[PDB]
Amino acid sequence: CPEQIVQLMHMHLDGDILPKDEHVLNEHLETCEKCRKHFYEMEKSIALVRSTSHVEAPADFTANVMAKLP
Amino acid sequence: EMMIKKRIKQVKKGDQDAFADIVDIYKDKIYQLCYRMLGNVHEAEDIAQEAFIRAYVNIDSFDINRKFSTWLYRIATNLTIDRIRKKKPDYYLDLELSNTIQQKILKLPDKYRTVIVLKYIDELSLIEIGEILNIPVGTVKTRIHRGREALRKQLRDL
Ligand SMILES: [Zn+2]
């Protein structure tokens, strides 16, 4: 198992992977149940923290800020 | 933006009302940043307000040529980092889905928590995250790789 491979997993997720390096990564995931599982676990986690982009400022937030100003 | 700079120009010259436009445009983003860093509604609204008030107070210090949001985020990030550290007791010596995500976000060290929230919740670039945190683009990349790995340990089992 090349210790290099998680660096490939991360370059992929950065949108940074080389076209050459992408083919190498794809080849290893296909023949490695532990490196699919690792890469599947990061993608899941990313997906789950992306589903928390819904927060908005409480009611009358602006009005509160403007009264607090000098 | 074109609009915000124009609003900033009004603020500097005496027009306090024109700041309200700056608050509306960024209120949700800034409150969201503090709430996902702190995980508590009461401290979030507090620090989000302080960031905007501090932004107004120091508006003349702001370089008009640089991006304003980057400036405002830096203020908010520094207030929340500071609060997170204050909580740590030894500081002055020396099954709902998104709430489960939230509580797992708080188990990340502030240096990885920041980049994950800015990159994955707030959808900023590495270049802008660096500017906000005053660290090289290389270092932010590294922190994200570590954050993704820390995040994986916490969230895989959901
Ligand atoms: Zn492997």
CSV table of C-alpha atoms and ligand atoms in Angstrom, one decimal:
chain,number,residue,atom,x,y,z
A,1,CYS,CA,0.0,0.0,0.0
A,2,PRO,CA,1.7,3.3,-1.1
A,3,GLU,CA,1.8,5.7,1.8
A,4,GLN,CA,1.6,8.4,-1.0
A,5,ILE,CA,-2.1,7.4,-1.7
A,6,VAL,CA,-3.9,9.6,0.9
A,7,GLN,CA,-2.1,12.7,-0.6
A,8,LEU,CA,-3.7,11.6,-3.9
A,9,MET,CA,-7.1,11.3,-2.1
A,10,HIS,CA,-6.6,14.9,-0.8
A,11,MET,CA,-5.5,16.4,-4.2
A,12,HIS,CA,-8.6,14.9,-5.7
A,13,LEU,CA,-10.9,16.6,-3.1
A,14,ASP,CA,-9.0,19.9,-3.6
A,15,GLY,CA,-10.0,19.9,-7.3
A,16,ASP,CA,-6.2,19.9,-7.7
A,17,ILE,CA,-5.4,16.4,-9.0
A,18,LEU,CA,-3.2,16.0,-12.1
A,19,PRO,CA,-4.8,14.2,-15.1
A,20,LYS,CA,-2.0,11.6,-14.8
A,21,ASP,CA,-2.3,11.3,-11.0
A,22,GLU,CA,-6.1,10.8,-11.2
A,23,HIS,CA,-5.7,7.6,-13.3
A,24,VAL,CA,-3.2,6.2,-10.7
A,25,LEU,CA,-5.6,7.0,-7.8
A,26,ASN,CA,-8.6,5.3,-9.6
A,27,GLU,CA,-6.5,2.2,-10.3
A,28,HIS,CA,-5.6,1.8,-6.6
A,29,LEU,CA,-9.1,2.4,-5.1
A,30,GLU,CA,-10.4,-0.3,-7.5
A,31,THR,CA,-8.0,-3.0,-6.1
A,32,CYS,CA,-7.9,-1.8,-2.4
A,33,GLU,CA,-11.0,-2.3,-0.1
A,34,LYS,CA,-9.3,-0.3,2.7
A,35,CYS,CA,-8.5,2.8,0.4
A,36,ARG,CA,-12.0,2.8,-1.0
A,37,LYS,CA,-13.3,2.7,2.6
A,38,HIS,CA,-11.0,5.5,3.6
A,39,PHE,CA,-11.9,7.7,0.6
A,40,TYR,CA,-15.7,6.8,1.0
A,41,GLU,CA,-15.5,7.9,4.6
A,42,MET,CA,-14.1,11.4,3.8
A,43,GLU,CA,-16.6,12.0,1.0
A,44,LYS,CA,-19.5,11.1,3.4
A,45,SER,CA,-18.2,13.4,6.1
A,46,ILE,CA,-17.7,16.3,3.6
A,47,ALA,CA,-21.3,15.7,2.3
A,48,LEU,CA,-22.6,15.7,5.9
A,49,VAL,CA,-20.9,19.1,6.9
A,50,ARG,CA,-22.1,20.6,3.6
A,51,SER,CA,-25.7,19.9,4.7
A,52,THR,CA,-25.3,22.5,7.5
A,53,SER,CA,-25.0,25.7,5.3
A,54,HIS,CA,-28.6,26.8,6.2
A,55,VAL,CA,-28.0,29.2,9.2
A,56,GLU,CA,-29.3,32.7,9.0
A,57,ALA,CA,-29.1,35.7,11.3
A,58,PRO,CA,-31.8,35.9,14.0
A,59,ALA,CA,-34.8,38.3,13.7
A,60,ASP,CA,-34.0,42.1,13.9
A,61,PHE,CA,-30.2,41.4,13.8
A,62,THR,CA,-29.5,44.6,11.8
A,63,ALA,CA,-31.7,46.7,14.1
A,64,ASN,CA,-29.7,45.5,17.1
A,65,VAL,CA,-26.3,46.2,15.5
A,66,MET,CA,-27.4,49.8,14.6
A,67,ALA,CA,-28.5,50.7,18.2
A,68,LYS,CA,-25.1,49.4,19.5
A,69,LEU,CA,-23.1,51.7,17.3
A,70,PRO,CA,-21.5,55.0,18.6
B,1,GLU,CA,-18.6,44.5,-5.1
B,2,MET,CA,-19.4,47.9,-6.7
B,3,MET,CA,-22.4,48.5,-4.4
B,4,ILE,CA,-20.7,47.7,-1.1
B,5,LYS,CA,-17.7,50.0,-1.8
B,6,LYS,CA,-20.1,52.8,-2.5
B,7,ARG,CA,-21.9,52.1,0.8
B,8,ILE,CA,-18.5,52.1,2.6
B,9,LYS,CA,-17.7,55.5,1.0
B,10,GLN,CA,-21.0,56.9,2.4
B,11,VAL,CA,-20.2,55.4,5.9
B,12,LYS,CA,-16.7,57.1,6.0
B,13,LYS,CA,-18.3,60.5,5.2
B,14,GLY,CA,-20.9,60.5,8.0
B,15,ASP,CA,-23.8,58.5,6.7
B,16,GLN,CA,-24.5,56.0,9.5
B,17,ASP,CA,-27.7,54.6,7.8
B,18,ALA,CA,-25.7,53.3,4.9
B,19,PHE,CA,-24.1,50.8,7.2
B,20,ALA,CA,-27.4,48.9,7.5
B,21,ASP,CA,-26.9,47.8,3.9
B,22,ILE,CA,-23.5,46.4,4.8
B,23,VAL,CA,-25.1,44.5,7.8
B,24,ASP,CA,-28.0,43.0,5.7
B,25,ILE,CA,-25.7,41.8,2.9
B,26,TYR,CA,-23.4,39.9,5.3
B,27,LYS,CA,-25.5,39.3,8.5
B,28,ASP,CA,-26.3,35.6,7.6
B,29,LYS,CA,-22.8,34.7,6.5
B,30,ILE,CA,-21.1,36.2,9.7
B,31,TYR,CA,-23.7,34.8,12.2
B,32,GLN,CA,-23.4,31.4,10.5
B,33,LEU,CA,-19.6,31.5,10.8
B,34,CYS,CA,-19.7,32.2,14.5
B,35,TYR,CA,-22.6,29.8,15.2
B,36,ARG,CA,-20.8,26.9,13.5
B,37,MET,CA,-17.5,27.8,15.3
B,38,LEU,CA,-19.1,28.1,18.8
B,39,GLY,CA,-22.2,25.9,18.5
B,40,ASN,CA,-24.3,28.1,20.8
B,41,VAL,CA,-26.9,30.7,19.7
B,42,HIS,CA,-26.3,33.1,22.5
B,43,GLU,CA,-22.5,33.6,22.0
B,44,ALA,CA,-23.0,33.5,18.2
B,45,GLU,CA,-25.3,36.5,18.0
B,46,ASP,CA,-23.0,38.3,20.5
B,47,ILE,CA,-19.8,37.8,18.6
B,48,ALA,CA,-21.5,38.4,15.2
B,49,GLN,CA,-22.7,41.8,16.5
B,50,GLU,CA,-19.4,42.7,18.0
B,51,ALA,CA,-17.7,41.9,14.6
B,52,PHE,CA,-20.1,44.4,12.8
B,53,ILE,CA,-19.8,47.1,15.6
B,54,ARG,CA,-16.0,46.7,15.5
B,55,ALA,CA,-16.2,46.9,11.7
B,56,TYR,CA,-18.0,50.3,11.9
B,57,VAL,CA,-15.6,51.6,14.6
B,58,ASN,CA,-12.6,50.9,12.5
B,59,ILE,CA,-14.1,51.6,9.1
B,60,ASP,CA,-11.6,54.5,8.4
B,61,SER,CA,-8.7,52.0,8.9
B,62,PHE,CA,-10.1,49.8,6.1
B,63,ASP,CA,-8.2,50.0,2.8
B,64,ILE,CA,-10.8,50.8,0.2
B,65,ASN,CA,-8.8,49.0,-2.5
B,66,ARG,CA,-8.8,45.5,-0.9
B,67,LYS,CA,-12.0,43.3,-0.5
B,68,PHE,CA,-14.2,44.3,2.4
B,69,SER,CA,-15.7,40.8,3.1
B,70,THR,CA,-12.2,39.4,3.6
B,71,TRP,CA,-11.7,42.2,6.2
B,72,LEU,CA,-15.0,41.6,7.9
B,73,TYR,CA,-14.4,37.8,8.1
B,74,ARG,CA,-11.0,38.4,9.7
B,75,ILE,CA,-12.6,40.4,12.4
B,76,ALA,CA,-15.3,37.7,13.0
B,77,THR,CA,-12.8,34.9,12.9
B,78,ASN,CA,-10.5,36.6,15.5
B,79,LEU,CA,-13.4,37.2,17.8
B,80,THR,CA,-14.6,33.5,17.7
B,81,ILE,CA,-11.0,32.1,18.0
B,82,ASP,CA,-10.4,34.3,21.0
B,83,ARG,CA,-13.7,33.1,22.6
B,84,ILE,CA,-13.1,29.4,21.9
B,85,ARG,CA,-9.7,29.8,23.6
B,86,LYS,CA,-11.2,31.8,26.6
B,87,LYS,CA,-13.5,28.9,27.3
B,88,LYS,CA,-10.6,26.4,27.8
B,89,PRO,CA,-10.5,26.4,31.7
B,90,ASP,CA,-6.7,26.7,31.9
B,91,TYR,CA,-6.4,29.7,29.5
B,92,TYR,CA,-5.4,32.5,32.0
B,93,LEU,CA,-3.0,30.2,33.8
B,94,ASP,CA,-0.6,30.5,30.8
B,95,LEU,CA,-30.1,12.1,17.0
B,96,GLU,CA,-30.9,15.3,15.1
B,97,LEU,CA,-28.7,15.5,12.0
B,98,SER,CA,-27.2,19.0,11.8
B,99,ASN,CA,-26.9,19.4,15.7
B,100,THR,CA,-25.0,16.1,15.6
B,101,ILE,CA,-22.8,17.5,12.8
B,102,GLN,CA,-22.5,20.7,14.9
B,103,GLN,CA,-21.4,18.9,18.1
B,104,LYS,CA,-18.8,17.0,16.0
B,105,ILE,CA,-17.6,20.3,14.4
B,106,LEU,CA,-16.7,21.5,18.0
B,107,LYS,CA,-14.4,18.4,18.6
B,108,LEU,CA,-12.0,19.9,16.0
B,109,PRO,CA,-9.1,22.1,17.1
B,110,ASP,CA,-9.8,25.8,16.3
B,111,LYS,CA,-7.1,25.8,13.5
B,112,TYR,CA,-8.8,23.0,11.6
B,113,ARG,CA,-12.4,24.0,12.6
B,114,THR,CA,-11.9,27.4,11.0
B,115,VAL,CA,-10.8,26.2,7.6
B,116,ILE,CA,-13.5,23.5,7.4
B,117,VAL,CA,-16.2,26.0,8.2
B,118,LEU,CA,-14.9,28.6,5.8
B,119,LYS,CA,-14.2,26.0,3.0
B,120,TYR,CA,-17.2,23.7,3.3
B,121,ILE,CA,-20.0,25.6,5.1
B,122,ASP,CA,-19.2,29.2,3.8
B,123,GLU,CA,-17.7,28.0,0.4
B,124,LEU,CA,-14.6,30.4,0.2
B,125,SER,CA,-11.5,29.9,-1.8
B,126,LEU,CA,-8.1,28.8,-0.4
B,127,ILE,CA,-6.7,32.1,-1.4
B,128,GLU,CA,-9.4,34.0,0.5
B,129,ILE,CA,-9.2,31.7,3.6
B,130,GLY,CA,-5.4,32.4,3.7
B,131,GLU,CA,-6.0,36.2,3.5
B,132,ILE,CA,-8.6,36.0,6.3
B,133,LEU,CA,-6.3,33.8,8.5
B,134,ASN,CA,-3.0,35.5,7.4
B,135,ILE,CA,-1.3,32.3,6.5
B,136,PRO,CA,0.1,31.0,3.1
B,137,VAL,CA,-2.2,29.1,0.6
B,138,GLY,CA,0.0,26.1,1.3
B,139,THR,CA,-0.6,26.1,5.0
B,140,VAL,CA,-4.4,26.4,4.5
B,141,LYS,CA,-4.4,23.4,2.2
B,142,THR,CA,-2.5,21.4,4.8
B,143,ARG,CA,-5.0,22.4,7.5
B,144,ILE,CA,-7.9,21.3,5.3
B,145,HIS,CA,-6.3,17.9,4.7
B,146,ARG,CA,-6.0,17.5,8.5
B,147,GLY,CA,-9.5,18.8,9.1
B,148,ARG,CA,-11.0,16.4,6.5
B,149,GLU,CA,-9.1,13.6,8.4
B,150,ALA,CA,-10.3,14.8,11.8
B,151,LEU,CA,-13.8,15.2,10.4
B,152,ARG,CA,-13.8,11.6,9.0
B,153,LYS,CA,-13.2,10.1,12.5
B,154,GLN,CA,-16.2,12.1,13.9
B,155,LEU,CA,-18.8,11.8,11.0
B,156,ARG,CA,-18.3,8.4,9.2
B,157,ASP,CA,-20.6,6.6,11.6
B,158,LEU,CA,-23.6,8.9,11.1
C,1,ZN,ZN,-4.7,0.8,-0.2
